[PDB]
Amino acid sequence: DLASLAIYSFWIFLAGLIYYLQTENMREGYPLENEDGTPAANQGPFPLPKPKTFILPHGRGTLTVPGPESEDRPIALARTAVSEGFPHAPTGDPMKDGVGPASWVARRDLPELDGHGHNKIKPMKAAAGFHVSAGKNPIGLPVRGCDLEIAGKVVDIWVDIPEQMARFLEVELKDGSTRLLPMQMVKVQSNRVHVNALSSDLFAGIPTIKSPTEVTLLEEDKICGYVAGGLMYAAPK
Amino acid sequence: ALLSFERKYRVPGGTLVGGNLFDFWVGPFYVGFFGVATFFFAALGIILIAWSAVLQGTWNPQLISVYPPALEYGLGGAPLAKGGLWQIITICATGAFVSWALREVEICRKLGIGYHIPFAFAFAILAYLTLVLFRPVMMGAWGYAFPYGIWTHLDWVSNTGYTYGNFHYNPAHMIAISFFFTNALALALHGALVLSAANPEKGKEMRTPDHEDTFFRDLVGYSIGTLGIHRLGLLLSLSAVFFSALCMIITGTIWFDQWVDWWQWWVKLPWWANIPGGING
Amino acid sequence: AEYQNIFSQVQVRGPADLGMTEDVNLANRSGVGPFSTLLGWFGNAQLGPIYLGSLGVLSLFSGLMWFFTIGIWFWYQAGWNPAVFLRDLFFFSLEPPAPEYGLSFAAPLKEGGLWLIASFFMFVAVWSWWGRTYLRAQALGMGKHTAWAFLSAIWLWMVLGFIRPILMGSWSEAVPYGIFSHLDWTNNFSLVHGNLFYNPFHGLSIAFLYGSALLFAMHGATILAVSRFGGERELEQIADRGTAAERAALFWRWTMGFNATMEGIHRWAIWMAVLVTLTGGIGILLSGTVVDNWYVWGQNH
Numbered sequence: 001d002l003a004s005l006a007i008y009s010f011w012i013f014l015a016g017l018i019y020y021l022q023t024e025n026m027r028e029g030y031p032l033e034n035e036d037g038t039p040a041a042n043q044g045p046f047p048l049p050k051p052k053t054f055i056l057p058h059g060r061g062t063l064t065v066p067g068p069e070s071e072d073r074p075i076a077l078a079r080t081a082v083s084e085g086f087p088h089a090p091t092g093d094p095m096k097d098g099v100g101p102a103s104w105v106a107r108r109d110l111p112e113l114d115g116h117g118h119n120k121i122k123p124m125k126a127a128a129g130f131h132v133s134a135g136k137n138p139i140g141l142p143v144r145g146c147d148l149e150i151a152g153k154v155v156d157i158w159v160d161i162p163e164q165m166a167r168f169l170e171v172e173l174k175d176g177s178t179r180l181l182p183m184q185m186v187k188v189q190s191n192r193v194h195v196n197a198l199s200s201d202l203f204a205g206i207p208t209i210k211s212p213t214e215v216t217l218l219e220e221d222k223i224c225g226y227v228a229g230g231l232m233y234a235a236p237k
Numbered sequence: 238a239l240l241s242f243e244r245k246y247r248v249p250g251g252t253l254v255g256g257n258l259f260d261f262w263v264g265p266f267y268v269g270f271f272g273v274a275t276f277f278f279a280a281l282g283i284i285l286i287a288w289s290a291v292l293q294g295t296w297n298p299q300l301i302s303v304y305p306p307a308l309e310y311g312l313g314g315a316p317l318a319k320g321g322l323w324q325i326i327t328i329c330a331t332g333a334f335v336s337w338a339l340r341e342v343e344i345c346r347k348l349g350i351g352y353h354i355p356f357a358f359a360f361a362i363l364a365y366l367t368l369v370l371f372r373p374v375m376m377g378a379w380g381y382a383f384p385y386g387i388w389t390h391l392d393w394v395s396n397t398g399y400t401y402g403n404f405h406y407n408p409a410h411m412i413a414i415s416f417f418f419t420n421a422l423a424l425a426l427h428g429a430l431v432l433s434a435a436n437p438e439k440g441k442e443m444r445t446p447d448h449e450d451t452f453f454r455d456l457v458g459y460s461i462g463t464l465g466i467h468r469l470g471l472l473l474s475l476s477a478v479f480f481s482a483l484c485m486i487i488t489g490t491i492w493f494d495q496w497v498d499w500w501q502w503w504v505k506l507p508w509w510a511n512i513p514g515g516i517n518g
Numbered sequence: 519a520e521y522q523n524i525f526s527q528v529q530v531r532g533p534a535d536l537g538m539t540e541d542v543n544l545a546n547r548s549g550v551g552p553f554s555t556l557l558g559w560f561g562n563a564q565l566g567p568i569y570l571g572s573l574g575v576l577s578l579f580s581g582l583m584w585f586f587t588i589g590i591w592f593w594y595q596a597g598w599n600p601a602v603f604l605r606d607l608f609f610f611s612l613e614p615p616a617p618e619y620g621l622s623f624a625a626p627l628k629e630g631g632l633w634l635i636a637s638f639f640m641f642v643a644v645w646s647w648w649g650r651t652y653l654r655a656q657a658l659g660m661g662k663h664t665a666w667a668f669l670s671a672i673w674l675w676m677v678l679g680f681i682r683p684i685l686m687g688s689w690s691e692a693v694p695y696g697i698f699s700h701l702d703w704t705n706n707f708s709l710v711h712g713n714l715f716y717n718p719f720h721g722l723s724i725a726f727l728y729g730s731a732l733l734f735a736m737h738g739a740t741i742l743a744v745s746r747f748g749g750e751r752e753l754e755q756i757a758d759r760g761t762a763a764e765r766a767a768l769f770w771r772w773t774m775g776f777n778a779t780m781e782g783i784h785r786w787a788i789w790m791a792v793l794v795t796l797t798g799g800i801g802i803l804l805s806g807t808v809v810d811n812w813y814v815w816g817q818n819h
């Protein structure tokens with residue numbers, strides 16, 4: 001009967017499709033690893049997918065996945081148990097070392113480019129025409145930590161030019177330098193900017209950017225990692 | 238085993254209950270207190286379903302069906318074989334679902350991410366509880382709830398729906414459907430778009446999000462943007478489930494007739510109600 | 519409380535993006551529209567520009583002729599009375615020809631002929647638009663995933679309106695043009711074919727419809743939850759994985775024992791949705807042509 005043939009056929013197709021989908025979703029992070037870093041004997045029922053190449057725009061090279069994987073950065077963690085399945089504990093300052101919820105990934109130390117190859121994220125002072133169109137303008141407002149103390153004042157907004165959204169607030173500290181605070185980690189209010197994640201005295205530990213008019217992907221990761229990491233590691237304060 | 242990049246994230250912390258006592262993983266799975274709770278609740282209900290299938294006399298999953306108490310039982314407990322098994326499986330399901338949510342929250346805290354996923358899953362739970370708890374209670378009996386069986390719950394949807402004529406005419410069912418349809422539309426497009434940018438034509442460099450935006454603008458005169466589309470998908474799916482829950486919570490409690498009759502508020506309105514012609518004149 | 523990134527705190531506005539050029543023919547691209555602050559709280563404020571080429575104008579023309587045909591028929595059922603038109607807007611129906619006419623195009627205007635005309639115009643409008651989703655992607659150098667996914671929606675519509683009615687020997691089997699009448703047609707269709715719940719292709723279709731809401735809730739929430747690490751910038755996370763992509767993946771690995779990648783979640787997504795209408799189309803195609811009664815069929819096979 002043709003309907004029975006069709007339903008049975010479709011179920012075969014669907015198993016084929018699920019197999020395809022799971023292997024496509026093994027292009028990052030595989031092969032699996034023992035907690036000591038060596039390859040795990042158990043890699044699952046699905047095989048590693050055959051590698052694929054992306055050609056990055058603007059002469060930025062090519063990425064092949066899956067491929068030779070490393071975190072090219074030291075991980076300041078130690079094993080908590082002989083056997084597998086237990087937490088690995090920070091050996092140092094987890095926030096300054098980039099571990100747990102403070103983690104960052106060794107992305108390219110270059111800025112994301114828009115379609116025409118200009119920097120995607122620029123401070124508003126370097127971005128002709130850009131202004132606050134609605135909601136409270138945060139420039140000039142004080143910045144306040146979870147300890148309720150002032151960390152600095154907002155001197156600019158860093159904007160995703162192509163998407164026209166505020167991504168960071170640039171914040172001047174008492175010492176005169178500045179840092180970037182992710183927009184999604186601040187609550188802008190009528191008389192101040194609150195930052196639940198960090199005490200005032202931890203804003204300086206926010207990683208600093210090499211150039212004052214651009215930010216690399218590597219820097220963004222360190223900044224967002226450090227700042228999210230305070231929800232857990234600055235919490236006792 | 239671990240993903241190649243996972244180790245640096247498997248630190249202690251983020252539990253809500255039990256401190257470090259349950260702060261470990263089994264294989265890929267994070268445990269926590271709510272993982273042991275999930276396991277306990279799920280184990281008991283699975284077992285209780287097994288008992289229910291021995292009583293009914295079958296092992297075929299297509300046949301197994303655990304019915305709620307008959308309506309005559311109101312909101313009292315019932316004997317195991319005559320509805321009580323369903324009531325305890327329903328308690329277990331709710332505990333397991335809620336514990337899964339709270340476990341999700343613990344994982345959120347350890348990974349230092351927002352709580353949007355369990356918040357969202359909670360709408361699914363509120364839909365289950367609507368059909369299983371809120372609506373049955375408002376109507377006065379657990380027997381108004383749905384049976385736990387693969388095909389018998391379908392028969393329940395059919396019977397419940399046909400009690401009010403064509404359930405298509407439920408106004409909140411309509412809104413709900415539009416959200417479901419619009420969500421599938423949206424997901425197909427978002428998957429397509431991202432994938433069409435990352436996997437461009439042969440002989441071409443990976444596209445940028447500016448191409449994504451340009452594509453939607455060319456096609457439709459508006460791009461909602463990367464943040465926006467994920468905002469939108471979450472809103473469409475969530476709104477679909479809210480209006481599903483709403484369209485049932487008002488059925489049998491504040492509405493009792495065939496749902497097509499609701500639409501006289503527009504038709505039989507006194508001024509044009511009597512004008513000759515049209516469909517209703 | 520923290521803040522959730524559902525609505526924007528501060529909107530930011532700059533020079534309008536005119537878009538990528540690539541091989542897009544700029545002559546067919548319009549001027550930029552106005553900015554909507556209302557929209558800018560939830561997504562981008564920019565309206566326009568929009569591209570209209572040979573095929574888009576054709577699509578819009580056939581689509582307006584479709585709406586105008588249904589419209590003129592609706593006014594006729596209303597006796598040219600504006601009061602009646604508004605009150606029975608949803609009850610009006612432009613029905614296909616009766617079964618007596620088979621697949622003939624020789625039905626009188628007021629007994630199915632106009633339905634056939636409306637259908638012609640809708641057919642040109644949808645296929646014109648499909649060719650257009652392809653062409654807009656081609657001109658930008660993008661893959662054709664959008665047009666391929668859209669074929670899946672088109673296939674359900676093609677079966678309901680055209681392939682199935684033809685296979686059954688009469689236009690009377692197609693869907694009428696009305697709000698309520700199409701609902702009634704859908705209920706009558708399940709009743710006549712012996713409960714569509716028991717069509718395993720309806721059940722799969724529902725699995726993927728529900729599953730499409732499951733997966734977009736899961737993915738929408740996920741990406742917003744990692745937006746503090748720039749996770750919504752999905753394309754750059756695919757080219758150079760960030761802690762956003764890693765945390766998202768680990769959330770799910772630790773929750774359900776497996777996970778996706780930034781790229782692969784969008785394949786799960788495109789297939790979850792596409793399958794809705796692909797399966798559903800098979801189930802309708804098979805109804806009446808092959809299986810008269812789904813419940814009955816289901817108890818034997």
Ligand code: BCL
Nearest residue numbers: 361362364365394395397398403404405413414481482485
């Ligand atoms: C003949 C039948 C009637 C009818 C009668 C009903 C009735 C009765 C109901 C619906 C409801 C719905 N109908 Mg209707 N419906 C009809 C025709 C249609 C049509 C159409 C094209 O004709 C459409 C699109 C719909 C669409 C819908 C949805 C809007 C809604 C179901 C979604 C939902 O509630 O999810 C919500 C999701 C859940 C409840 C899932 C909960 C999941 C839980 C939390 C997790 C489970 C975990 C699991 C156990 C673990 C597995 C373990 C492992 C992984 C192994 N109906 C016809 C006209 N319809 C229902 C509704 O709105 O209910 C709220 C409802 O009660």
Ligand code: BCL
Nearest residue numbers: 283365368383387388391394720721722724725728729732
């Ligand atoms: C929402 C409105 C109605 C309803 C109306 C319908 C209709 C109509 C249909 C279904 C169908 C299904 N429904 Mg239902 N269903 C309801 C409530 C539920 C509940 C619940 C606890 O709330 C559950 C678990 C299910 C589960 C299911 C699946 C068995 C099946 C495919 C759905 C799917 O993939 O969704 C999306 C989810 C995923 C893709 C994730 C995977 C979920 C898996 C597949 C669920 C397995 C359930 C398992 C057997 C339950 C036992 C667990 C154990 C004892 C360990 N329904 C309510 C009462 N349901 C379809 C079917 O084919 O059934 C015969 C179908 O046509």
Ligand code: BCL
Nearest residue numbers: 671672674675704705707708714720723724727798799801
């Ligand atoms: C009593 C009624 C029957 C029933 C009879 C039917 C029938 C009949 C059908 C369905 C179909 C479906 N039903 Mg059912 N269905 C019932 C009960 C349910 C229940 C439930 C009770 O819980 C659920 C969850 C569902 C769920 C579903 C869906 C999975 C499926 C539609 C998928 C879709 O996306 O269509 C929406 C998408 C489309 C129609 C694609 C069309 C896209 C076109 C090309 C766009 C044209 C737009 C046009 C140009 C104008 C607008 C453009 C503007 C400019 C914006 N049904 C009851 C049991 N159901 C359909 C199916 O596939 O069956 C297997 C179908 O034909």
Ligand SMILES: CC[C@H]1c2cc3[nH]c4c(c3C)C(=O)[C@H](C(=O)OC)c4c3nc(cc4[nH]c(cc(n2)[C@@H]1C)c(C(C)=O)c4C)[C@@H](C)[C@@H]3CCC(=O)OC/C=C(\C)CCC[C@H](C)CCC[C@H](C)CCCC(C)C
Nearest residue numbers: 282330333337357358360361385386387478728731732735
């Ligand atoms: C609200 C928007 C949509 C949504 C969202 C959503 N669902 C979610 C989530 C989110 C955000 C999760 O984070 C969570 C998840 O982890 O997914 C991978 C989940 C989830 N959604 C799931 C299923 C699901 N969601 C559904 C729907 C939806 N989910 C909505 C449309 C549906 C249906 C029917 O449409 C189903 C079937 C699970 C995969 C998962 C929750 C897993 C879980 O709760 O684990 C703990 C419990 C068990 C492992 C088993 C409990 C066993 C019981 C004790 C016995 C079974 C009783 C049951 C009531 C009988 C059912 C019989 C049926 C035949 C009717």
Ligand SMILES: CCNc1nc(NC(C)(C)C)nc(SC)n1
Nearest residue numbers: 426427449450453460461462463
């Ligand atoms: C890059 C994100 N752009 C974008 N824009 C839009 N616009 C509408 C209005 C169709 C949702 N959609 C998507 S995916 C649906 N993506």
Ligand SMILES: [Cl-]
Nearest residue numbers: 571573574650
């Ligand atoms: Cl065109």
Ligand SMILES: [Fe+2]
Nearest residue numbers: 427431741752
């Ligand atoms: Fe996405």
